[PDB]
Design an enzyme around this catalytic site. Structure first.
Site, PDB file in Angstrom:
ATOM      1  CD  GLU A 759      -3.232  -0.003   0.022  1.00 21.91           C
ATOM      2  OE1 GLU A 759      -4.428  -0.359   0.008  1.00 21.91           O
ATOM      3  OE2 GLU A 759      -2.801   0.947  -0.664  1.00 21.91           O
ATOM      4  CG  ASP A 760       0.198   3.562  -2.375  1.00 25.01           C
ATOM      5  OD1 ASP A 760       0.413   2.974  -3.457  1.00 25.01           O
ATOM      6  OD2 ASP A 760      -0.939   3.934  -2.020  1.00 25.01           O
ATOM      7  CB  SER A 761       5.074   1.382   2.133  1.00 20.31           C
ATOM      8  OG  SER A 761       6.157   1.514   3.027  1.00 20.31           O
ATOM      9  N   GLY A 900       5.607   7.034  -1.637  1.00 20.54           N
ATOM     10  CA  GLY A 900       5.431   6.105  -0.544  1.00 20.54           C
ATOM     11  C   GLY A 900       6.426   6.395   0.551  1.00 20.54           C
ATOM     12  NE  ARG A 932      -1.761   4.083  -7.133  1.00 22.64           N
ATOM     13  CZ  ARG A 932      -0.762   4.275  -6.277  1.00 22.64           C
ATOM     14  NH1 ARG A 932       0.483   3.947  -6.597  1.00 22.64           N
ATOM     15  NH2 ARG A 932      -1.011   4.812  -5.094  1.00 22.64           N
TER      16      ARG A 932
END
Ligand SMILES: [Zn+2]
Ligand SMILES: [Zn+2]
Ligand SMILES: [Zn+2]
Ligand SMILES: [Zn+2]
Lengths: 1131, 67, 117
Positions: A759-761, A900, A932
């Site tokens: 999740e965007d990390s 992230g 994305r």
RNA sequence: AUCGAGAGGA
């Protein structure tokens, strides 16, 4: 002779480089300011009327010439010295130059006793100077000279220094003036409305808007009305025509309808005639206008005079404000009515409010001119009062004492300092957001802020039409760079080759049209206007012509030869409607384009040859424009242009699309702005991703400016090891991203490894971070000054003492010196003292007012600077230095919207490794790609692997058919790698191969300003606000977090009543009051003597204690302030 | 601002190669051949030398604080 | 039927309004500013084309053939001059729903013939 | 310290 396709990619970029060698990126700011200083100030001073004052003797006081010296500074001794911009930044001065005006006062009393006294160079004010402008001391200096002055040679300039603060004027959008625009409002009494914001050439008053509307159907037919300025009632158009001296209906329709063979126009104008028949002479019509006005004179004489003055001055000033112009005004108002009828008859399209051909960009020059007009008018007023109070006594006066120069100086300084664009008194009618603090976080942020445009529609407005990316923004505004918050589509950015016109006088064009076969508008008969073509110049219908085609050919030849027509002049021929509109005014956004012959470019190979040796033969961009090979085309002239995207479009094809092109793109990638021109392969990303990167390139760390060692900025982040991207676009060569990059090439592996990048990390390499990977230094400047404002109380820098100072915290002051200032190199922790300041009292005779560190920083003092501010007390700046090593929670981003935070950091033995022991610097999650659709990220990673293995820099320019994924893969397979960028990785913990071959390679990552240590905050019974005894607001105030209405609603849904009471009563503002059981009003309690009594009821036994929030007590008291009786009845 | 000491990825020393790299480039080597001459075979170290921007040379254009 | 145009007085140059002469039972056009009268020749005072059956060929002008942004075709020669090339375009005019219809104009100079397929 | 404004984050 012809540039072949194989050479084209060089030729075009050579041309582009020449442009940026000539102009730069902040050319619009500098040209605007230069025009304002060279022309606008002088025009404003001369356009002011001479102030004739007399009791007898009389004085005129005519201002005739201006002189703007270089920027200087006056010390307390008064010695003028040349002030450098860096000295202004350090000392909190204003980088301004003095403006002196020549004044001529002639004495005229009687008997031809005349004598003139001229005061040469009367100091009229101080004007702040835009850096790197012609009137800047950094003008024409070499890079060595700028470095000698502690200036960055890459600094673009284009901003002001007001009180040491770098302020940048944002270009403001506005509807163009002197142009008729026919709209149709769905919800209004009018079916169609044709407006014209009219403004004289040299501005002296606001835009006088005139509307010519048609009443919506439902007496008999559709009536045409005209909403004149300074008149609060609609006026029939026929009445206005008669008031201008055209009483016969034939004359009026001669002026309105140019083709008498057209009964449709005739019947649609007939209702207006039928409505105005009782009024049939000029004086009666003027009386009607005056009566409909908001100041109806009881006597018709002054009514008629007022109507005359309105119809001569406020109605259509751009047509002419002098007398005997009624013919031109009648022709123009008839043109407005004609345009309205064409719209109502469907023969013309309604005008588009969003078309940028209909808009103008109000730049630094024309904005400072608005300020200067207001301020010079106020100055002349003050001079009038001062001189009047002296000549009323019958004696001479000194104009030097009449001129209080603080008007212009303080006005310009205040307006640029605050951004409130207007007079300081009208601080609410003034429009803020102009003149923002220049963003110095990274070089891209500075460039973009200097190329920033603003649509002042209002963020509150929820209509999406002005926020939409209009078709006409092509080449003028970046399609991608825009804030994604509440100002989507309103705040814009120039495209790279976009040039905002600076303005020019239409005099040479009008003179040539006179010498040419144009016929003036007063000399013609209206019968000729039918087949003839109208000619407008800056909105004014000046005449008509018979062969518009060869007129346009002549004018285009003249502009391409740099003859009387300058390059920025727009010349639009509308063919279906026979207008030819010529524009020379300022604010017209345009862009350069390659002119096209029959089906060939005029840019031959000889031009590219001379451009290649640009540094020897001084053959520059201006020689390319003067050769008639390049042309600046504005948004409105693009409508008449047929563009070729590339010279390949000019090739003869099996089926010809156009075969009649007129221009060609220099390169399509120039549609992007500064921050979007850094994205590699932006045409392989989803567009929101490109917008998010264009926003996030501005928070990326780098080296924001070369001379950062001398700047005392409030906040500054410098990256230890900035790197240029391995995969770059050909536009960054002009953004100077290669000289001041804002990121690092990281070996990034897109993989699912331990679940700490979901999740965007991202998972970063702890070993790489130990080696200086994405390490930065954070510089924070604290300012302080000791004020000797009066003998009542004076501040002073000195090491405080426990025996004399009163408000002295328990923190130790040993780090300070006897001068009261900490020394460089001293390690300072949170809450420590850096400046020991004490203020004399009226713990005796002095109180501690020391400057502490912003809490929880823990830096080292980088340097200390001491000087004197403008007024001249001691002034200190202390820069503290804090090394920021990346950690869990720090935000990182690629150039593709892939942001992230660091989830975890693994050491090199814990990270996954290739057969040759390469570990990724960063690991990002594959789930960030599919939704994305940032395929540019993957192509950049693959191109970067090829670049690193080949020893080159990848070309990621957006639209390049010589670079696709198959070529990059074939190149990568030549270096012993899987052609698609995958590699077998091994688990770092166990050493076993990972079943799925991982996609790994160099990608340019950015470290963003948003570090977790600047965001983490906690509270447990800290300080409280004064008014309502609730926790403060902010980390800096040690405040508490807001438990808002939505949190209250959530906990109500949970049913957690005690937690809700804890959050909204006991953890915020517990309080007690004493209430009278009879009247329910808060009583008087005395708990020391235990005497409780209500003055209202005159009882002292029936009082009750009530536990209520302090905010509720404050509410009830503010209601009692309003005569409301909130009676808390406990029974 | 200055050439890093180690490669961020592997930890190979690259600090002693910037000057040699520039000397090879003015000797009419291609960047790839220059990187091969210095023994940078992993594309991480080639990244380190190939993407470096020597900003210290620009910071040395300013006179120091003390003479 | 055709539309009816406005006609102006011969003395005051104001528009003539319709009036009826009972004595001869005949239409007259008289000025309400001066005292002029005229014998009408059309007998029709008002015409409303609700259908809006307008021949848009009359609205076109030959000068549009000089527009570089219009498409050109060699497939529709000119019936008046025989020129091969011709520009074409759609109505793009309000109050015209079936506006996909194409109008052609001859690009030969001084011919300027306009037509429709 | 207050207030306002602006720039930003999610
Ligand atoms: Zn009571
Ligand atoms: Zn390495
Ligand atoms: Zn008449
Ligand atoms: Zn023809």
């Amino acid at each position: 002779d012809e540039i072949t396709p194989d050479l084209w990619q060089e030729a075009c970029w050579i041309v582009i480089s020449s442009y940026f060698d000539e102009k730069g990126l902040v050319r619009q700011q500098l040209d605007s300011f230069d025009e304002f200083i060279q022309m606008s100030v002088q025009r404003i001073v001369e356009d002011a009327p001479p102030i004739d004052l007399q009791a007898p003797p009389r004085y005129l006081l005519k201002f005739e010439q201006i002189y703007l010296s270089k920027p200087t500074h006056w010390e307390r001794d008064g010695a003028p010295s040349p002030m450098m911009p860096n000295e202004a930044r350090l000392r909190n001065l204003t980088y301004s130059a003095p403006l002196y005006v020549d004044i001529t006062k002639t004495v005229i009393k009687e008997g031809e006793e005349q004598l003139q006294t001229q005061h040469q160079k009367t100091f009229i004010g101080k004007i702040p100077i835009m850096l790197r402008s012609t009137y800047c001391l950094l003008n024409g200096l070499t890079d060595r000279d700028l470095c000698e002055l502690n200036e960055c040679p890459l600094d673009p300039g284009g901003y002001f220094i007001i009180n040491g603060s770098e302020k940048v004027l944002i270009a403001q959008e506005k509807m163009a003036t002197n142009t008729v625009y026919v709209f149709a409002k769905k919800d209004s009494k009018y079916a169609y409305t044709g407006e014209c914001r009219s403004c004289l050439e040299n501005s002296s008053r606001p835009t006088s808007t005139i509307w010519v509307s048609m009443l919506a159907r439902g007496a008999i037919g559709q009536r045409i009305v005209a909403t004149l300025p300074y008149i609060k009632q609609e006026v029939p158009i026929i009445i206005v025509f008669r008031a201008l001296g055209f009483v016969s209906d034939r004359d009026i329709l001669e002026h309105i309808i140019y083709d008498f063979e057209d009964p449709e126009m005739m019947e649609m104008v007939k209702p207006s005639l039928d409505e105005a028949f009782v009024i049939q002479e000029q004086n009666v019509a003027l009386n009607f206008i005056g009566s409909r006005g908001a100041k109806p004179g009881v006597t018709k004489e002054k009514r008629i005079k007022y109507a005359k003055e309105v119809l001569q001055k406020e109605m259509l000033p751009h047509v002419g404000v002098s007398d005997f112009c009624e013919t031109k005004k009648a022709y123009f108002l008839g043109y407005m009515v004609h345009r309205l009828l064409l719209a109502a008859l469907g023969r013309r399209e309604l005008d588009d409010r969003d078309h940028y051909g209909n808009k103008r960009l109000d730049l630094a020059g024309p904005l400072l001119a608005f300020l200067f007009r207001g301020m010079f008018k106020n100055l002349l007023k003050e001079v009038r009062i001062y001189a009047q109070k002296f000549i009323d006594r019958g004696k001479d006066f000194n104009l030097e004492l009449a001129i209080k120069t603080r008007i212009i100086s303080d006005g310009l300084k205040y307006s640029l300092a605050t951004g409130n664009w207007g007079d300081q008194k009208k601080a609410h009618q003034a429009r803020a957001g102009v003149s923002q603090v220049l963003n110095r976080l990274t070089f891209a942020s500075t460039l973009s802020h200097l190329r920033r445009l603003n649509s002042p529609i209002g963020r509150d407005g929820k209509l999406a039409k002005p926020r939409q990316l209009h078709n006409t923004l092509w080449g003028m505004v970046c399609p991608a760079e825009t804030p994604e918050g509440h100002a989507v589509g309103l705040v814009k950015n120039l495209a790279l080759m976009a040039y905002i016109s600076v303005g020019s006088q239409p005099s040479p064009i009008l003179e040539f049209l006179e010498e040419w076969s144009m016929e003036n508008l007063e000399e013609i008969s209206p019968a000729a206007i039918a087949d003839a073509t109208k000619i407008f110049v800056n909105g004014c219908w000046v005449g008509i012509h018979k062969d518009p085609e060869q007129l346009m050919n002549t004018l285009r030849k003249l502009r391409r030869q740099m003859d009387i027509i300058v390059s920025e002049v727009s010349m639009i021929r509308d063919i279906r409607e026979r207008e030819i509109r010529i524009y020379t005014d300022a604010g017209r956004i345009c862009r350069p384009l390659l002119i096209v012959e029959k089906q060939k470019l005029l840019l031959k190979k000889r031009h590219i040859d001379q451009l290649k040796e640009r540094e020897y033969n001084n053959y520059s961009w201006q020689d390319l424009v003067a050769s008639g090979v390049v042309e600046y085309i504005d948004t409105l002239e693009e409508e008449t242009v047929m563009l070729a995207m590339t010279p390949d479009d000019l090739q003869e094809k099996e089926v010809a699309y156009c075969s009649t092109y007129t221009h060609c793109e220099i390169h399509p990638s120039m549609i992007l702005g500064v921050c979007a021109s850094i994205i590699p392969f932006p045409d392989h990303n989803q567009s929101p991703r490109n917008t998010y990167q264009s926003a996030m390139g501005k928070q990326a760390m780098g080296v924001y400016i070369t001379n950062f060692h001398v700047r005392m900025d409030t906040l500054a982040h410098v990256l230890y090891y900035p790197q240029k991207p391995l995969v770059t676009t050909r536009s960054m060569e002009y953004l100077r991203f290669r000289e001041l990059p804002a990121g690092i090439n990281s070996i990034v592996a897109i993989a699912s490894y331990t679940g700490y990048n979901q999740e965007d990390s991202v998972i970063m390499n702890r070993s790489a971070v130990d080696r200086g990977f994405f390490r930065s230094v954070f510089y924070r400047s604290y300012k302080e000054q000791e004020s000797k404002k009066g003998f009542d109380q004076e501040e002073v820098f000195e090491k405080p003492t426990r025996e004399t100072c009163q408000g002295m915290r328990h923190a130790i002051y040993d780090k300070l010196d006897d001068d009261g200032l900490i020394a460089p190199g001293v390690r300072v922790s949170g809450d420590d003292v850096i400046i020991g300041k004490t203020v004399t009292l009226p713990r005796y005779t002095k109180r501690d007012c020391s400057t502490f560190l912003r809490t929880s920083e823990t830096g080292i003092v980088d340097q200390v600077m001491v000087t004197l501010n403008q007024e001249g007390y001691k002034f200190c700046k202390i820069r503290v230095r804090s090394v920021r090593i990346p950690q869990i929670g720090d935000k990182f981003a690629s150039r593709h919207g892939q942001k992230g935070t660091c989830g975890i950091q693994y050491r090199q033995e814990d990270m996954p490794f290739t057969c040759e022991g390469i570990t990724p610097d960063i690991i990002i999650n594959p789930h960030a790609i599919p939704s994305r659709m940032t395929i540019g990220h993957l192509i950049e990673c693959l191109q970067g692997k090829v670049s690193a293995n080949k020893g080159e820099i990848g070309d990621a320019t957006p639209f390049n058919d010589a670079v696709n994924v198959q070529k990059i893969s074939n190149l990568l397979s030549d270096y012993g790698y899987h052609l698609r960028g995958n590699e077998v990785l091994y688990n770092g913990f166990t050493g076993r191969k990972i079943t799925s071959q991982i996609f790994i390679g160099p990608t340019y990552y950015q470290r963003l300003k948003h570090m977790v240590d600047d965001k983490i905050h906690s509270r447990a019974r800290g300080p409280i606000q004064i008014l309502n005894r609730q926790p403060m607001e902010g980390r800096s105030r040690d405040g508490g977090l807001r438990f808002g209405e939505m949190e209250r609603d959530c906990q109500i849904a949970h049913g957690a009543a005690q937690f809700l009471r804890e959050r909204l009563f006991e953890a915020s503002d517990p309080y007690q009051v004493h209430v009278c059981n009879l009247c329910g009003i808060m009583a008087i309690a005395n708990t020391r003597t235990h005497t409780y009594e209500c003055r209202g009821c005159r009882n002292k036994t029936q009082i009750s204690l009530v536990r209520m929030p302090y905010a509720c007590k404050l509410l009830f008291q503010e209601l009692m302030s309003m005569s409301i009786a909130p009676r808390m009845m406990s029974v | 601002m200055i050439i890093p000491v180690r490669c961020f990825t592997c930890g190979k020393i690259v600090g002693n190669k910037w000057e040699a790299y520039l000397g090879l480039l003015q000797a009419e080597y291609t960047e790839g051949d220059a990187l091969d001459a210095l023994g940078l075979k992993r594309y991480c170290c080639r990244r380190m030398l190939l993407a470096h921007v020597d900003l210290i040379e620009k910071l040395l254009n300013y006179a120091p604080l003390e003479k | 039927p055709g539309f009816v145009g406005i006609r102006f007085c011969q003395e005051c140059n104001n528009m003539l309004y319709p009036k009826e002469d009972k004595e001869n039972r005949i239409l007259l056009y008289a000025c309400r500013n001066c005292d002029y009268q005229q014998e009408a020749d059309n007998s029709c005072i008002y015409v409303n084309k609700i259908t809006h059956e307008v021949d848009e060929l009359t609205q076109i002008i030959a000068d549009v053939s000089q527009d570089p942004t219009l498409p050109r075709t060699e497939d529709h020669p000119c019936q008046k001059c025989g020129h091969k090339e011709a520009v074409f375009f759609q109505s793009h005019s309000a109050r015209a729903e079936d506006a996909m219809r194409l109008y052609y104009v001859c690009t030969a100079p001084h011919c300027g013939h306009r037509w429709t397929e």
